Amino acid sequence: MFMINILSLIIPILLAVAFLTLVERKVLGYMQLRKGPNVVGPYGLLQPIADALKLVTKEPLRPGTSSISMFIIAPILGLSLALTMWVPLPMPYPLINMNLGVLFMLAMSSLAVYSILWSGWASNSKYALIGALRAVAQTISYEVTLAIILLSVLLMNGSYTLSTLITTQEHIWMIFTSWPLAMMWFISTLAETNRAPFDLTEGESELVSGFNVEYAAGPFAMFFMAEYANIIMMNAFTAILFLGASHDPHTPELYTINFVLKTLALTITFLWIRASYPRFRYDQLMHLLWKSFLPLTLALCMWHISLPIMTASIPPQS
Amino acid sequence: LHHALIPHGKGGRSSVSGIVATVFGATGFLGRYVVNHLGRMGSQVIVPYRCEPYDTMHLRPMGDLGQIIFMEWNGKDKDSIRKVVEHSNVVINLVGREWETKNFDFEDVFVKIPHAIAQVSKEAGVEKLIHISHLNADIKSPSRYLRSKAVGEKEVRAAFPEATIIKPSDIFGREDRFLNYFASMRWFGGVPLISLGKETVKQPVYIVDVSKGIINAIKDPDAKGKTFAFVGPNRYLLFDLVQYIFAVAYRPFLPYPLPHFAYRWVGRLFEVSPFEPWTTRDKVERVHMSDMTLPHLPGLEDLGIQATPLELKAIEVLRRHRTYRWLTSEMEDVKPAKTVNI
Amino acid sequence: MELVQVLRRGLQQVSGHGGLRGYLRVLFRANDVRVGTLVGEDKYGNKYY
Amino acid sequence: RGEYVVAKLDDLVNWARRSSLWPMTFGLACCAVEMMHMAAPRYDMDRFGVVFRASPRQSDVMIVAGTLTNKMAPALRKVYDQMPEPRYVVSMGSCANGGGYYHYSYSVVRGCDRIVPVDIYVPGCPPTAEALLYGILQLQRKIKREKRLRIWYRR
Amino acid sequence: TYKFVNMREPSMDMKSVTDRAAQTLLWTELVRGLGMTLSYLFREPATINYPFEKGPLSPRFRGEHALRRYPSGEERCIACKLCEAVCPAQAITIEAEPRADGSRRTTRYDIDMTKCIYCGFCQEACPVDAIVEGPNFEFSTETHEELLYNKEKLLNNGDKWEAEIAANIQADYLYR
Amino acid sequence: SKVKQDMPPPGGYGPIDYKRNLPRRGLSGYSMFAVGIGTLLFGYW
Numbered sequence A: 001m002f003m004i005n006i007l008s009l010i011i012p013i014l015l016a017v018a019f020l021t022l023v024e025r026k027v028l029g030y031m032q033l034r035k036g037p038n039v040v041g042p043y044g045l046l047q048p049i050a051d052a053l054k055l056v057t058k059e060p061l062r063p064g065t066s067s068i069s070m071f072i073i074a075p076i077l078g079l080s081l082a083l084t085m086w087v088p089l090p091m092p093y094p095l096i097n098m099n100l101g102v103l104f105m106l107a108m109s110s111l112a113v114y115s116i117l118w119s120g121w122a123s124n125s126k127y128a129l130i131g132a133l134r135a136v137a138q139t140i141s142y143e144v145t146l147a148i149i150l151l152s153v154l155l156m157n158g159s160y161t162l163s164t165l166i167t168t169q170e171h172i173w174m175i176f177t178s179w180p181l182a183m184m185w186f187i188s189t190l191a192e193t194n195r196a197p198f199d200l201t202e203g204e205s206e207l208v209s210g211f212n213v214e215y216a217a218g219p220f221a222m223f224f225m226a227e228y229a230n231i232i233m234m235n236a237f238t239a240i241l242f243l244g245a246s247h248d249p250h251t252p253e254l255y256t257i258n259f260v261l262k263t264l265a266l267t268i269t270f271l272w273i274r275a276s277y278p279r280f281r282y283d284q285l286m287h288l289l290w291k292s293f294l295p296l297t298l299a300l301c302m303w304h305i306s307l308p309i310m311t312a313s314i315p316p317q318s
Numbered sequence B: 001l002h003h004a005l006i007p008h009g010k011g012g013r014s015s016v017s018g019i020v021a022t023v024f025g026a027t028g029f030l031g032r033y034v035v036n037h038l039g040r041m042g043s044q045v046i047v048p049y050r051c052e053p054y055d056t057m058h059l060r061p062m063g064d065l066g067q068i069i070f071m072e073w074n075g076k077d078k079d080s081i082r083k084v085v086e087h088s089n090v091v092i093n094l095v096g097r098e099w100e101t102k103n104f105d106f107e108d109v110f111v112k113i114p115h116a117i118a119q120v121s122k123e124a125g126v127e128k129l130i131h132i133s134h135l136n137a138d139i140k141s142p143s144r145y146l147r148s149k150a151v152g153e154k155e156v157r158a159a160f161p162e163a164t165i166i167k168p169s170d171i172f173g174r175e176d177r178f179l180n181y182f183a184s185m186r187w188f189g190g191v192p193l194i195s196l197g198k199e200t201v202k203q204p205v206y207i208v209d210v211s212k213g214i215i216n217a218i219k220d221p222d223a224k225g226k227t228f229a230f231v232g233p234n235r236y237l238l239f240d241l242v243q244y245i246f247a248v249a250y251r252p253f254l255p256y257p258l259p260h261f262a263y264r265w266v267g268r269l270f271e272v273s274p275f276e277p278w279t280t281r282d283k284v285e286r287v288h289m290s291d292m293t294l295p296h297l298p299g300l301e302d303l304g305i306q307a308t309p310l311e312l313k314a315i316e317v318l319r320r321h322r323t324y325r326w327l328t329s330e331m332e333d334v335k336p337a338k339t340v341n342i
Numbered sequence C: 001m002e003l004v005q006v007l008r009r010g011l012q013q014v015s016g017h018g019g020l021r022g023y024l025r026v027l028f029r030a031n032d033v034r035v036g037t038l039v040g041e042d043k044y045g046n047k048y049y
Numbered sequence D: 001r002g003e004y005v006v007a008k009l010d011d012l013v014n015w016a017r018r019s020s021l022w023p024m025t026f027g028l029a030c031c032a033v034e035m036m037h038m039a040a041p042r043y044d045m046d047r048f049g050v051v052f053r054a055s056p057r058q059s060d061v062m063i064v065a066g067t068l069t070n071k072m073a074p075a076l077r078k079v080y081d082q083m084p085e086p087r088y089v090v091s092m093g094s095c096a097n098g099g100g101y102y103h104y105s106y107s108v109v110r111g112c113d114r115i116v117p118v119d120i121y122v123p124g125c126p127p128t129a130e131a132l133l134y135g136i137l138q139l140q141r142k143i144k145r146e147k148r149l150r151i152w153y154r155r
Numbered sequence E: 001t002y003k004f005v006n007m008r009e010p011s012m013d014m015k016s017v018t019d020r021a022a023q024t025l026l027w028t029e030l031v032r033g034l035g036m037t038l039s040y041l042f043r044e045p046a047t048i049n050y051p052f053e054k055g056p057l058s059p060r061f062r063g064e065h066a067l068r069r070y071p072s073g074e075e076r077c078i079a080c081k082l083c084e085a086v087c088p089a090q091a092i093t094i095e096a097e098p099r100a101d102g103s104r105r106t107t108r109y110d111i112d113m114t115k116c117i118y119c120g121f122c123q124e125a126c127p128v129d130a131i132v133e134g135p136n137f138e139f140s141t142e143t144h145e146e147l148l149y150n151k152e153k154l155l156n157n158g159d160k161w162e163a164e165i166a167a168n169i170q171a172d173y174l175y176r
Numbered sequence F: 001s002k003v004k005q006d007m008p009p010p011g012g013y014g015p016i017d018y019k020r021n022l023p024r025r026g027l028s029g030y031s032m033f034a035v036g037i038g039t040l041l042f043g044y045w
């Protein structure tokens, strides 16, 4: 009944998250002219298992300066958030048809920043604390543009129902109508998901590991997997928003093939984009955001509200 | 001395002291410190290891090139001993398991192997042997810790005529499972000790004082046969440990005089976990039992090694238990425990 | 037309390397299936290409 | 049988750890650059586990590359204790092995053994980049011949 | 002769500003960066498949000292000790003694692997090409002691390789 | 036997390029803007 669908959703999501470590080290290498993880497992099919098993068998360190109460809620607050965020995704017929799904996705996206904020406080180290402090301030600054991009896009779509996305985007991809906002949206995804040029914390040398500065194997599994988990989905959210497929009621297989391929290709570009650009300095993040990204997004929201009024093109919410 | 056994050097790492101290079961606490002392002036300390080489890896840094010669051995195998002490001019026993194992009956860990290594060493052609007994070693005591210690103590005494048997008191150190133990009732519960502590007086001793005792016993020729007892500087009634330890760690003091009846149940339940018996039924009455004076046998004080007070060095083991808010607190902020002693 | 030609070359790799068992062995032992000419075998059983 | 069960678990844990080490770079001298060629595509190491996760907390094996100095002595050491177990250290090159070309010098401790328990020694000045890949591989097989769960069963 | 580097001047005309404005808004040099990496993705890798594939070397490679022997069988080292004097790390420890036959032979030849630097000076020292650096690098160890080589290990290394290093000095003594 | 050390051929070697030869690829500045606006108008319609 219902529960068997719950595991049938989150469990394949979780197992895909573990494997994404492989391609991060492999397709980068095949672009870096390296080989990527190949020796362990046929074609490196078993490296994520080897990666995940020691993290669940290595010693879980709790620094004496770390509050154990805060040390344990945060990794749960992060991973669980990523999984429950998947429930309104419109996989043919979504598991959760929340008519306010767009707000629902955005609301707990803001809830994500408590995961880093508490971890930075829990770790309680001078370098660690500032690293999280000037990490949360980045994520919150990128949500204002995130909301405005969303608000403009579904204004032409209709209501906030995530299932309506496939109805408005019937004949033409929505990107053809909001491509100036699509790249506006795509870079915003690159920043909330904590990936280069906004890797920042998880940067292997930017903040050595940022949210994982003192946070090693054991509980660290639920803090380096969650960021990669949001990567597949927030790209998939872009796939639904701007690259919507077709859904035949008598054959939902077509939209499963099309959406999965589209979101997998986007994640390739997401892994493509780390291996081609440097890291923004902290001031450059705000300079790019508040003074170039923020004004442009406002102007585009100016345009996308009048255009349905301009051409009598208001969408039906029902 | 033998042609190459003759000592040489200023007591450095690459100085030969001529003492070949094959220590038995050095992969824990006192073994770690004695080899550290043994390797300081330079000595071929052949350590028969039985666990994974990884856990024995940390003994390597305290020895010069070609000094810490780890050797595979097994307790049951008769030839296992004979190979590791064949050329050792001195043998320092350290075998023994403070907790219990199904394959290792508590008789063995203080009777079988200690007798199983004392006779081979005397057959090999050694000069000395040091088997570590307990300061309270007494078979008639209800302590299987004491019951197995005493019978094994006289067996090696009977087997080895020159068996310099050492009977230290409750030693304390970084991994003594005595201080870090007594800090652990806060984690476990409300200090389920017996009679609020006003029934037991013990005399803890700092491990380096103990370890310096054996090596000083090595150079001392008259130590053969004589049964030295390693005793701390001052005794301590059991309650004073509990409040002082909870003070030098800044832990919430929650004492509770739980009688021996229910405290014996929690011993077996701690052994229930089939990975390590945190507390055993032997450890139930182990702490309730007090330390006898034992004044006739000579101590380390006349051997040249003085005794360091417990309150002099507590956070060196207990700063780990100190929370972040109070990790910086030293002895001075904490009152000294009542020295119930001689 | 090159796609099937390269795919045909891939099939020759499977057939040349001991068919099924040979290809599976070298993939799970050497992590490669490149078929190559034989130079010989000195004394042990270690084959070189 | 029980020994079979503990053998299968031992293989599963050992195969995971040996195949996916996460080394942390502690290069100090020319021994760092040649290992740093193992990162170069010629002798790629990320082909088998050893990856860029770095983050000395998230590290299994530490490679001490280059000469070790007395003023470097404590800061390197405190890194080793903070490194969670299973921790193994790789001695890179003649200088880190036993002091090498500066053995008779005042600002270098002869070898890393005086500081950390060295599990593997790779000779060279500097060792060839692929020779370390062999050293990592032989360390990998060293983990393969480990009996942690077996030795626990005997106890 | 010399040359500036950052002396390009931006043109202010309508055409030039349009390309720069287009570049800023429509990220093109960023896409150019993307194209560079993507073209490299479809570029074949150069990852040598160790141990099955091994990196190239030259007949002059230096490593893993090994005393040689004359075609008759007697070892080459006559204890001329030029290698000891030359050795810039003093890793060599040689003690001589008159052998029962009468000719010299080193009774003690220890070269400390973790004091040596593989500079290749020692082969250039002894005029009897006694000690040479072989082609081995596959002698990584797990205990510091086995690195401390002696005369017996050195001879065993020499007898082990010999044939490989026999051709190496045959194809290189012309250069020397 | 005369000198046989490693020598370049009498013609030396092939002239090796060393200039900065970044190939200017792209589209006209107005063309990029025009095609961007054109897709928007088509999408709006």
Ligand SMILES: CCCCCCCCCCCCCCCCCC(=O)OC[C@H](COP(=O)([O-])OCC[N+](C)(C)C)OC(=O)CCCCCCCCCCCCCCCCC
Pocket: A179, A180, A181, A182, A183, A184, A186, A187, A197, A242, A273, A277, A287, A288, A291, A292, A293, A296, A303, E024, E025, E026, E027, E030, E031, E034, F036, F037, F040, F041
């Ligand atoms: C009738 C028409 C109506 C609509 C007309 C709208 C106007 C015409 C179109 C304008 C351009 C489109 C909107 C603006 C886009 C640029 C916003 C901006 O701030 O740019 C300058 C900004 C900032 O440039 P800057 O910092 O050098 O200069 C800005 C100006 N100053 C200096 C004064 C602040 O550029 C960027 O943000 C660069 C990208 C950063 C992120 C790195 C990754 C980029 C990956 C690119 C490849 C992948 C793209 C994927 C696209 C999505 C796919 C689904």
Ligand SMILES: NC(=O)C1=CN([C@@H]2O[C@H](COP(=O)(O)OP(=O)(O)OC[C@H]3O[C@@H](n4cnc5c(N)ncnc54)[C@H](OP(=O)(O)O)[C@@H]3O)[C@@H](O)[C@H]2O)C=CC1
Pocket: B024, B025, B026, B027, B028, B029, B030, B031, B050, B051, B075, B094, B095, B096, B097, B098, B104, B109, B113, B132, B133, B134, B135, B167, B168, B169, B170, B171, B172, B176, B178
């Ligand atoms: N306060 C105290 O704790 C006092 C203790 N003692 C006695 O001193 C001895 C050593 O104490 P300590 O160093 O702190 O103890 P640890 O538990 O730290 O170490 C005990 C050692 O004994 C070895 N060992 C025990 N039984 C066997 C066996 N059957 N086969 C192989 N090795 C064995 C262990 O080897 P492995 O680790 O591989 O099992 C280990 O090296 C013990 O007998 C102890 O009871 C004496 C006086 C006071």
Ligand code: SF4
Pocket: D029, D030, D031, D065, D066, D067, D092, D093, D094, D095, D096, D099, D100, D101, D124, D125, D126, D127, E117
């Ligand atoms: S061993 Fe050689 S290469 Fe390595 S640090 Fe020392 S001198 Fe440099």
Ligand code: SF4
Pocket: E083, E086, E087, E088, E089, E090, E091, E092, E111, E115, E116, E117, E118, E119, E120, E121, E122, E123
């Ligand atoms: S290679 Fe150089 S340092 Fe090494 S033994 Fe020969 S002369 Fe000495």
Ligand code: SF4
Pocket: E076, E077, E078, E079, E080, E081, E082, E083, E084, E094, E122, E125, E126, E127, E128, E129, E130, E131
């Ligand atoms: S230089 Fe050569 S011949 Fe002379 S002692 Fe050394 S190895 Fe022997």
